[PDB]
C-alpha cells in the first residue's frame, strides 16, 4: 500500500526537513550525520558515546514503521545531536551544524503542532 497514515506522513516530514536542510551556500548539513563511521574508523567514538546514532538508523526505524509517535523520533535525533556535541569540540563545524539541525528539528515539530 503506497498511502501513508497521517502519523507516517508527519514522521517523514520531520525526517526530511532535517535531511534536506541546506544553508545559504547550499551545503547540506545532514551529509556527515547520515552514516556514522565504523568503530575501526573512529575507535574513541564508540568507547565514549554510549548509544551511537545516525540518520540511516533513524530512517530504518521509520521505514520499518517502528516509531509509534513523533516524540520517539525526536528523541533519537536529540540523542544523535547530543552525541555529536559530546564527541566534537564546541568550536568545530560539526558541533555547530548539530545545533542548527536541532533547531530545524524543533521548529519543524512546532510548525506541525496543529498539523
Ligand X SMILES: O=C(/C=C/N1CCC[C@H](c2ccccc2)C1)c1ccccc1O
- Which residues form the interface with ligand X (CB under 6 A)? 32-33, 36-37, 54, 80, 83-84, 87-88, 94
Asked if 54 contacts 80 with a C-beta cutoff of 8 angstroms, the reply is yes
Residue 32 Cβ, how far from ligand X at the closest point, in Å?
5
Give the residue closest to ligand X by C-beta: 84
Residue 50 Cβ, how far from ligand X at the closest point, in Å?
12
SS3 2: coil
Residue 88 Cβ, how far from ligand X at the closest point, in Å?
5
Residues 79, 74: Cα–Cα separation, whole Å: 8
The nearer residue to ligand X, 74 or 80, going by C-beta atoms, is 80
The nearer residue to ligand X, 57 or 112, going by C-beta atoms, is 57
Q: Is 83 exposed, middle or buried (0-12, 13-18, 19+ CB in 10 A)?
A: buried
Residues 65, 32: Cα–Cα separation, whole Å: 24
The nearer residue to ligand X, 7 or 93, going by C-beta atoms, is 93
Q: Is 69 exposed, middle or buried (0-12, 13-18, 19+ CB in 10 A)?
A: exposed
The nearer residue to ligand X, 36 or 62, going by C-beta atoms, is 36
Amino acid at each position: 500500500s503506497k498511502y501513508m497514515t497521517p502519523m507516517q506522513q508527519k514522521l517523514n516530514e520531520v525526517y526530511e526537513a532535517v535531511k534536506n536542510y541546506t544553508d545559504k551556500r547550499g551545503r547540506r548539513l545532514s551529509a556527515i550525520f547520515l552514516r556514522l563511521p565504523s568503530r575501526s574508523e573512529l575507535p574513541d567514538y564508540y568507547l565514549t558515546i554510549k548509544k551511537p546514532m545516525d540518520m540511516e538508523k533513524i530512517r530504518s526505524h521509520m521505514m520499518a514503521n517502528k516509531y509509534q509517535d513523533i516524540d520517539s523520533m525526536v528523541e533519537d535525533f536529540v540523542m544523535m545531536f547530543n552525541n555529536a556535541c559530546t564527541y566534537n569540540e564546541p568550536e568545530s563545524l560539526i558541533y555547530k551544524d548539530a545545533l542548527v539541525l536541532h533547531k530545524v528539528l524543533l521548529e519543524t515539530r512546532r510548525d506541525l503542532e496543529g498539523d
